[PDB]
Amino acid sequence: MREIVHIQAGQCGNQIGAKFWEVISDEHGIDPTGTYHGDSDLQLDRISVYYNEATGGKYVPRAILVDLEPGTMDSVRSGPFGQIFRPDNFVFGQSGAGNNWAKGHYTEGAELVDSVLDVVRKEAESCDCLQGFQLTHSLGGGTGSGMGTLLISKIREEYPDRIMNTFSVVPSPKVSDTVVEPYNATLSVHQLVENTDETYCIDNEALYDICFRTLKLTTPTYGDLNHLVSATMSGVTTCLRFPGQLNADLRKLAVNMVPFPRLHFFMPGFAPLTSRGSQQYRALTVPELTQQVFDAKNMMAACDPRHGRYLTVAAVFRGRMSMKEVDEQMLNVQNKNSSYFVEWIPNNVKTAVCDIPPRGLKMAVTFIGNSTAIQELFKRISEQFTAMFRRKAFLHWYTGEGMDEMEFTEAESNMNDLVSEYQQYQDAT
């Protein structure tokens, strides 16, 4: 019951999905071969949420792997957790999208989307009761953005009732691994804002600063960044998988997080994230974790929440803690940060608690903040988009793959409407 169908598109989405499934199988006690060797019965009690029980006790993940180029999926299949997935779910084309949203959406999308949707349908019909979907993708990429938008639209067509989450590695202010990132990102959020129900915005620079300031990693590879993102995924999706004193499912998170249908862009976070040495000095308590997640430098998106205001806040705790102090620490947070919470929301916090902590830690907490400071990121992306679009620097690549410039202007107009909506409630009184 309460199944979830996971999709991963793009190199970024595929790698984050690989680390996510590594973490999930690790904390459920499933070997890479798929045979369960875990100790707790609670791991098997809710294993149907993400896994299908194949014959002989082998647990197949309910995962769909997508990429228009086969290199990263071949790497995943060659990795230690290659055997865990079903071979049939590996769907790919023979040519990548480069970094062209047009190529990913229209040309290669029109070929591959049918196959991946029959795969998604085969997984969906197996569910006893299907809860919402999840997607991992990068807005800056071509393949991830285009295929993710196309799947989001068509899966909302086929399953309009279901919840539908996404985990987007949004572009960054300073670091940019692709020159056309503004175009790809703008078209991506233009498609996503109409269709999705929840989107959590990850920022690679923010992950780098978190690793440097808190974890003190001198050489943070993408493995550590994906480890943190997988930690956030396991934190948010814990209430379906484990018992808890306050259970908060994904639809509950949607109802608590989304005031208006288009403001569903969240800034996630996690605690504790201390280094090796700092664990001995720091006594981990619920006050310490609450102050850590509400510290701005801990946020996994580059935007400073102090620049904006919090519309809604959610905290999924994991481990064992008295909830009196969870509530009182949340109220001390609200009193100290009363300037940073919108008045028209009387209470912004959605608490949830789960009994079982992750990776043998005594405690953990996962933060989700719907705040108006994300308007700064959208302003930045729209400004870069307009700066390039004034000269139409790279529009011929997108026009060659079929689309019109009218689409680009429509996406810009919808971004302008989105930032106007975000600023309206900051200005409201």
Partner: protein
């Protein structure tokens, strides 16, 4: 002979039901397997439990939740053998803290099965006195399905008593953003069908635990234990024999003056740690005085901000009628505690012989005396003013209305519920007026 059907809706309702049936099993001596290993305890036992010819005893309980996780916790816990497997009703998907989802869409699928099980239990019941409902306003499953079930049970069994044990939304602390919406809508639907709803507050119980019990790490196990003690004190008159037996019909008749003013405030004394229990005497006068203090109320509402309009004291254990009589006369004479002039006799008294039982591993002290005080008072008009103000703040900008509209209800429902709660607050301030001429 005389039966009460317990119903437990939502996570809060079922968890409190776990604690409550644990306490009832401990009091009546029933093992978690359902068998009694063992004279006056028999009828006391027959009120809440159904006999089977094999010697096993089945609770007269219906556990309902639209998500299966908590009821599966029940089905895996120590009391799995105790409950009827069929009565544990589980929906497929959660209400997502949405009153509209829990009331209309997901509610209409499962309401028929819930009513069928309630009908079968009532058919078995030789003499039914009423229903005991446990839920929370903030929860979607709780609020919406409790409203649906309450209207259906009013239509079917409207003659008999219906008693809700609802968790009021706390003033400062909260666990949900849409909690004022859920609470306003469910109070609007519940005001007509409810006979009397006893109020409970998590923040108040947290403060009670921290002050009196000296518990710096209070869990919802502790809170549900206290709520279990409250309901056991209420139902001990029906179960055990006593010098003065209070039934549900007279609870209703004494506590509820008007149809729409039926919200008493729960309270237990002595709440005290075993460490400090040795020093204090804990006589009838002391526990009676402790009941009326503002600090020991289970709702964060200062009674000094209002006037009492119906108090009901339920003494259990080694208790003397002269002692309780002198205590109530003293409390009447005090002027810090104020009563409405139009209710010259503001106290209902009940006594019974059975003292409370301390759960193993509990935080409360063993006491030969206990009292449960239930007060209908105008202080909670302030709390409804707070909740209505929060509802106004969110609904003025349509903060979360689109979810409820998607799950099948109009803005007319929101406006009508707000108007009804405004009428309720008016009625409260009206009856708070002192009589003239």
């Amino acid at each position: 002979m005389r039966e009460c059907i317990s119903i437990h809706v939502g996570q809060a309702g079922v968890q409190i039901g776990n604690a409550c049936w644990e306490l009832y099993c401990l009091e009546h001596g029933i093992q978690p397997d359902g068998q009694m290993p063992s004279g006056g305890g028999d009828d006391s036992f027959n009120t809440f439990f159904s006999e089977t010819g094999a010697g096993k005893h089945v609770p007269r309980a219906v556990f309902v939740d639209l998500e299966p996780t908590v009821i599966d916790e029940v089905r895996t816990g120590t009391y799995r053998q105790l409950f009827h497997p069929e009565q544990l009703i589980t929906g497929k998907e959660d209400a997502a803290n949405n009153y509209a989802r829990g009331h209309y869409t997901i509610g209409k699928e499962i309401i028929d099965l819930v009513l069928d099980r309630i009908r079968k239990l009532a058919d078995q019941c030789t003499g039914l006195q009423g229903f005991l409902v446990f839920h929370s306003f903030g929860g979607g499953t709780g609020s919406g399905f409790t409203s649906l079930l309450m209207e259906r049970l009013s239509v079917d069994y409207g003659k008999k008593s219906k008693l809700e044990f609802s968790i009021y939304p706390a003033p400062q602390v909260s666990t949900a953003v849409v909690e004022p919406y859920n609470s306003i809508l469910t109070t609007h639907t519940t005001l007509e069908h409810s006979d009397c709803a006893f109020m409970v507050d998590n923040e108040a119980i947290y403060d009670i635990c921290r002050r009196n019990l000296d518990i710096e790490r209070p869990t919802y196990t502790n809170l549900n234990r206290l709520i279990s003690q409250i309901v056991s004190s209420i139902t001990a008159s029906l179960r055990f024999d006593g010098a003065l037996n209070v039934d549900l019909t007279e609870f209703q008749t004494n506590l509820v003056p008007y149809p729409r003013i039926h919200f008493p405030l729960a309270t237990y004394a002595p709440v005290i740690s075993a460490e400090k229990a040795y020093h204090e005497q804990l006589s009838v006068a002391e526990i009676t005085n402790a009941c009326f203090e503002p600090a020991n109320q289970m709702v964060k509402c200062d009674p000094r901000h209002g006037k009492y309009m119906a108090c009901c004291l339920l003494y259990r254990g080694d208790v003397v009628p002269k002692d309780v009589n002198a205590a109530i006369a003293t409390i009447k004479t005090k002027r810090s505690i104020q009563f409405v002039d139009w209710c010259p006799t503001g106290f209902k008294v009940g006594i019974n012989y059975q003292p409370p039982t301390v759960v193993p591993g509990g935080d409360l002290a063993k006491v030969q005396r206990a009292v449960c005080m239930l007060s209908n008072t105008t202080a909670i008009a302030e709390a409804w003013a707070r909740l209505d103000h929060k509802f106004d703040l969110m609904y003025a900008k349509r903060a979360f209305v689109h979810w409820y509209v998607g799950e099948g209800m109009e803005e007319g429902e929101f406006s009508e519920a707000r108007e009804d709660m405004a009428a309720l607050e008016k009625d409260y301030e009206e009856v708070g007026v002192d009589s003239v001429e």
